[PDB]
Amino acid sequence: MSVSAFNRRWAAVILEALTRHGVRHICIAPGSRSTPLTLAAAENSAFIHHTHFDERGLGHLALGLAKVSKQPVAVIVTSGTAVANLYPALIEAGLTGEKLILLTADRPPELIDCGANQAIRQPGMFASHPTHSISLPRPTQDIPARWLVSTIDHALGTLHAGGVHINCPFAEPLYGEMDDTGLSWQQRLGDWWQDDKPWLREAPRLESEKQRDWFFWRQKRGVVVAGRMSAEEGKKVALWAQTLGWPLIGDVLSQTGQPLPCADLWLGNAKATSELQQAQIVVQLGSSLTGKRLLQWQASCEPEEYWIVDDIEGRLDPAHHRGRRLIANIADWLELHPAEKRQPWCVEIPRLAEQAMQAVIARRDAFGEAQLAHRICDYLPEQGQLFVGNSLVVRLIDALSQLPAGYPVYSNRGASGIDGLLSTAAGVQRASGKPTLAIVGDLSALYDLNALALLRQVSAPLVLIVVNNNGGQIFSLLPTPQSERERFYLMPQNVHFEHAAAMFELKYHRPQNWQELETAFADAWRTPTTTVIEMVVNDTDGAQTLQQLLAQVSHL
Amino acid sequence: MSVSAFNRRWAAVILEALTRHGVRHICIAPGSRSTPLTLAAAENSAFIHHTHFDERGLGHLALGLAKVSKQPVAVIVTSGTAVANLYPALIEAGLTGEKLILLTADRPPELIDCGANQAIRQPGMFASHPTHSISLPRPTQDIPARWLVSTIDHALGTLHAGGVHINCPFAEPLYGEMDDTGLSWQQRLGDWWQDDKPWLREAPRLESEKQRDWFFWRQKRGVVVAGRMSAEEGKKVALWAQTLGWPLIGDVLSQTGQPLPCADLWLGNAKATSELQQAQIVVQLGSSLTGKRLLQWQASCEPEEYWIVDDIEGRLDPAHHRGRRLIANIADWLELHPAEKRQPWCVEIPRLAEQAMQAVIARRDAFGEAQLAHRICDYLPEQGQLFVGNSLVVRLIDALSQLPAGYPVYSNRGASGIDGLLSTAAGVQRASGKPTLAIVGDLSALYDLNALALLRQVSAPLVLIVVNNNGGQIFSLLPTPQSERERFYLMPQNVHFEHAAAMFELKYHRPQNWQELETAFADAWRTPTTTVIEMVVNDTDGAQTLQQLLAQVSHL
Ligand SMILES: Cc1ncc(C[n+]2c([C@@H](O)CCC(=O)O)sc(CCOP(=O)(O)OP(=O)(O)O)c2C)c(N)n1
Numbered sequence A, B: 001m002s003v004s005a006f007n008r009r010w011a012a013v014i015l016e017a018l019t020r021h022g023v024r025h026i027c028i029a030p031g032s033r034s035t036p037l038t039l040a041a042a043e044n045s046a047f048i049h050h051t052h053f054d055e056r057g058l059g060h061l062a063l064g065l066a067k068v069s070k071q072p073v074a075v076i077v078t079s080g081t082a083v084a085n086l087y088p089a090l091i092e093a094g095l096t097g098e099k100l101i102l103l104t105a106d107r108p109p110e111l112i113d114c115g116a117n118q119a120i121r122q123p124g125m126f127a128s129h130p131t132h133s134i135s136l137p138r139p140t141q142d143i144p145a146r147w148l149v150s151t152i153d154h155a156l157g158t159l160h161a162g163g164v165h166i167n168c169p170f171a172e173p174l175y176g177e178m179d180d181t182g183l184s185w186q187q188r189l190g191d192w193w194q195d196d197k198p199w200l201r202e203a204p205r206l207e208s209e210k211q212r213d214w215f216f217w218r219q220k221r222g223v224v225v226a227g228r229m230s231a232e233e234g235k236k237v238a239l240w241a242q243t244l245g246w247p248l249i250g251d252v253l254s255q256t257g258q259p260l261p262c263a264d265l266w267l268g269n270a271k272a273t274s275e276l277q278q279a280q281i282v283v284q285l286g287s288s289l290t291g292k293r294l295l296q297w298q299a300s301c302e303p304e305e306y307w308i309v310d311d312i313e314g315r316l317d318p319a320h321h322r323g324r325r326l327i328a329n330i331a332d333w334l335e336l337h338p339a340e341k342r343q344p345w346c347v348e349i350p351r352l353a354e355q356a357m358q359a360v361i362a363r364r365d366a367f368g369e370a371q372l373a374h375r376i377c378d379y380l381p382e383q384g385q386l387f388v389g390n391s392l393v394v395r396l397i398d399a400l401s402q403l404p405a406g407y408p409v410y411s412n413r414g415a416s417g418i419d420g421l422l423s424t425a426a427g428v429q430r431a432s433g434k435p436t437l438a439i440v441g442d443l444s445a446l447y448d449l450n451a452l453a454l455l456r457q458v459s460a461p462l463v464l465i466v467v468n469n470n471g472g473q474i475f476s477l478l479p480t481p482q483s484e485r486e487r488f489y490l491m492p493q494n495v496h497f498e499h500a501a502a503m504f505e506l507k508y509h510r511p512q513n514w515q516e517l518e519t520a521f522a523d524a525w526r527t528p529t530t531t532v533i534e535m536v537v538n539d540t541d542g543a544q545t546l547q548q549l550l551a552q553v554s555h556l
C-alpha cells in the first residue's frame, strides 16, 4: 500500500546488510530523495554517523575514515550533482584501496531524461573507477528481499579494495507515517535479522603464491625499496632489510625509520648510483614512491629481477621492469619470505647518506618551509599520527627529514590531489582518535577551505599547519617558463588564514620564529580541538633550498 | 625531435581551432601536465583568460560565462582528480545547454594503470554526460594536423548544446625551449592559420518544422506556461499570450513580467484548477519549472494537447502528456507561429491572482526571507541582472514576487545543485559586465566558500546576499520527520560570514532592518566590487510564511 513505507523497508535491508561486512562509519549529506537511506541509517544502532554539507568533502571524510580504520565506510548522498562530487574521493580510493560504499539516491526510471528537477543519468556515471557497480531496480515487493541482500553481499564480500557504487532509485512519496507495508516481505529473511553474518557468504581471497626461489634470490646483492605501507609493516621491513644486509631506501610514507635518510639527495650522487648498479634484484614493498631522484633511479635501474609486493592490484612499476608483481599483505609476505643474516654488501652509500643529512642539518636554522620539513620530527605529537599533504610538503619531508620507525603517516598519494586534504585529515583523526598533525600548502587549504567546519569536531588535538608561500610553489621548483609562471602556474591568492580560523571558532597562531612555533605547538596539544598554525614563508626559498642541497650532495 | 616543442605545436592547433567556433573565454587551473594547453592558450591573443585554484569552481565559472554569453567557453585542467572536479558543471551544462569545452590534460598511454603519480583512467570518465567526447591519441607527426583540426571542427560545429570532453594526452618532456619541431607539420594547414573559418565547416541546424495546424489550435482555449528563457524572449512571450487572450503562468526564470503573479499560491485554489480544466491546449515555452503547485497542476491537467517549445533537446514534460515536443529558438518559434487577437477566456484566475498578491503584500513588513523575496523587485540594480540561488530563495521569489518583464534572471536549475552558486555568479557577472544581484542560502555559500576569491574581481558592482537561516530550511518546508530533522536534514553550521568577507577583503554588512539593508544597497552599487550582505533570519519563518500564505489563498 504505502510507497513511503516500502521505500524505507527496502533501504533498511540495504543498510543492515552493510553492517554484516564491517561497515561502522557512515557519512551523510543532506537531501530529500535520500530520505529512505538516511532514515534507515539513522535508525540503525550499528553506525557512527558523520554529516557534512559539501559532498566532495564528505567523500574525502569517508576516505580518511576508511584509510585509517581499514574497514569499509558508507556514504549517503541525494540525487544530482551531489553524486558527481563524490568522484574525486572515489578515484583516489580506486588507486590506494580504501573501501568506500557509495549509496547514491536516484530518481525512479520514469523521471529520468524528461527534464525533471535534480534528475540525472546516474548508473555508470563513475565509469571504470568503482571496483563494483550496482544499479538497483525500482523498489517492488515482487523482487524478494533475499535478492537484494544477496546482491549487496556479493559486492561487499568479493571486494578486495576500492569503491562500490550502489545506485538507489526511490519513487515518491518519500514522507509519511510508517505502516506495515513490506513487513512480511522483510520477514522472509527470517532470523537473518538477528544474525551477525551475511545472508550470502562470498569471500574469496586474492593472493600471490609464495615464491619458491626466494631462498636463492635472497643470497644475491639486493636493494629494498619501501613505499606506502602500515606503520607496523614499516618496522618489520626495516628489520628484514637489515638482516638481509641490503640497503633500504625508505619513502616518507614507509615508517621504516629511513636508515639511509635523504635519499632524494644522495641518489643524485654518481657514487651512489654506481654502487646500486651492482644490485641483481630489487624488492619493492609498497608503492606510490615520492621522490624525484628515487623515481629516476627506479626508471634507470636494470636488475635481473624487479619485484613489487603490495596488497594493491595491478601493475605498480611505471618503468615496466622484467620481474614480478606480487599481491599480498606485506607483513604476511615477509613471514613467507624470511631473511637470513648476511653480511651487508653496500659500503659507500651509508657514508653518503650520513653526509647528506649533515648537509641538511647545517641549514636547519632559517625559518623556512625546507627547515620546517627537516625538523618536523620535533613536532610530532606523542602517540599521534601525521597527515602529509601534497605538492612541496611531502617532497620536502621525504628529502630532508628522517621520520621515526613505526610512527603512523597518512596521505592522499594515489592521484595526489590537492582537493580534499582537510576533510581527509578530519576523517583520519576521527577514525583513530589520535592526536594528529596535518600539514598542507596554502592553495590546498583554500581548495578545501570549508572542511574547517568538520575540524570543529575532533576527538583529540589536531594541528593544521598551513605553509603559506603565496601560490603553488612546486611550480617554482619545476622548470616552468618564467613569463607565464605567476599568472598561469603559481596563482598567488594573497590571503592569510586568520579569518578562516575565526569563522569556524578555531584557535590560530602565526609564529614568526622557532620559539613562537614551539610555543604554538605546546598550546595546541592541550585540548581536543583543532588549531590552525600558519607559517608564512618567502615564496621560492623552499624550492631553492632543495635545489641547492641537491647540488651540494651531488658533488660529495 | 623535440617532444616538448611538438606537444606545444599539437596544442596550438587545438586552441586556434576553437577560436573559429566563437570561443573567447578560457578558464585555466594550475598544473604541469596541462603545460602544452596552457601555454598555447596563454600565447593566443584571441582569448580572455580566467584562473582559479578549485577546479569545481573553475567549471562553474565557465558555466556562468557560457550561460550569459551564449558562446562556447573552454576549460583547461591538469590530469587526475582535477578532471573529476569538472563533473558538476558538465552535468549542469548537459541539462541547460551551456557549451563547455573541457580540455583535460592526461598522461600518455604508457603511464596509465601502472601506479604512476596523478595518472588515472580519463577517457569516458564523464560517461554519457558530455554531448560529444573526443579521446585524442598520443601526439605524433604521423597523424596530420588536418585530422586534428577536423576532429575538433566536427565536435564544435555539430554541437547543439552541452559539453564536449576533449582528453589530451601529453608525454614528457613538457618543458624546454621551443624549436622548429612540428613547424612543417603545422604549415600543412596553409593559410587556415590566417582564416576566421573552421577547417571543416559542419554545422547542421536542429529545428522542428512549422506546425501546420497552429491556426486551428490558436483559436482554442489555451494556457501559456513560461519557464526559463532569455530576457527578450520573456517579453515576446508576454505579448504573444496577451494577444491570444490566454492566461500566462510565468516562472521566476521567465522574465515575462508574471501578469498572473503568485501562481504557486493561487494554483492551490480549487476555483483556479476548475477553470484550467477547460483548457484544450497548453503551450509551454521554456522548461525547468520552479513551483510545486505549478508542477502539481502540470501533472494533473489533461488538455487535448500539451506542447513544449524550447531550444533544449529531448523530453521536457515530467508528466508525459500527449502532445508535442518542439525544438526551436523561442523567439523564432513565436514568429513562425504568431498570435491572433482573441478575447480572453479566463475570468476567475485574474481575480484570484490579484487576491493572492494582496495577501502577500499584507505581510510585507517583517524582516524575514519571505519578505525579502517578495520585495526583491524593488531592489534590482538598474540595467543589471539577477542571479538566483537554489533551495528556498528561488521558490520564495517565484511564489511571492512579481519580477519585471525583460529583466535578466540567471540560475542553475538544471540539476539545481547548491555546489557552485558563487563561482557561477562570478562568471555571470564577468560575461556581461553588468551590475549583479546574487542571492544564496547559508549552506550554498559555505559549499562554494572559496569562490569568494573570484568575487574579488568583478567589472561592475556585485551584491551577494547570503540569507542565513542556519541550515537548509527547505527541509523545514518539506514534511521531513521531526526527530531526525536537525541532524540529518537541516544541518545547521552556526556560522556567520563576516570573517569570510574579511579574508578576501570584501565589504560586508549585516543589516538589522530594512533601512540598514537599503543603506547597504545604495553604497554597494557605487563601486565595481563585491559587497557581501548577510541577512540573518529566524530559521523557520520563511518556510512557515509560505505555508501560511498557501493555506490562506487556497481558502479564498
Ligand atoms: C585537484 C588538483 N588540482 C590540481 C593539481 C595540480 N597541482 C599539483 C600537482 O602537480 C602535484 C601533486 C603531487 O603532489 O604530486 S601541486 C599544486 C599546487 C599546490 O599549491 P600549494 O598547496 O600552495 O602547495 P605548494 O606547491 O607546496 O606551495 C597543484 C595545483 C592537483 N595536484 N590536484
Ligand SMILES: Cc1ncc(C[n+]2c([C@@H](O)CCC(=O)O)sc(CCOP(=O)(O)OP(=O)(O)O)c2C)c(N)n1
Pocket (backbone or CB within 6 Å): A030, A031, A032, A055, A078, A080, A081, A082, A117, A118, B390, B391, B392, B393, B416, B417, B418, B419, B440, B441, B442, B443, B444, B445, B469, B471, B472, B473, B474, B475
Ligand atoms: C550539490 C547538492 N547537494 C545536495 C543538494 C540537496 N539540497 C537541496 C535540493 O534538494 C533542492 C534543490 C532545489 O531544487 O532547489 S536544497 C539544500 C539546502 C541548501 O541550504 P541553504 O543554502 O542554506 O538554503 P535554504 O534551504 O533555503 O535554507 C540541499 C542540501 C543539492 N541540491 N545540491
Ligand SMILES: [Mn+2]
Pocket (backbone or CB within 6 Å): A441, A442, A443, A467, A468, A469, A470, A471, A472, A473
Ligand atoms: Mn603554496
Ligand SMILES: [Mn+2]
Pocket (backbone or CB within 6 Å): B441, B442, B443, B467, B468, B469, B470, B471, B472, B473
Ligand atoms: Mn539556509
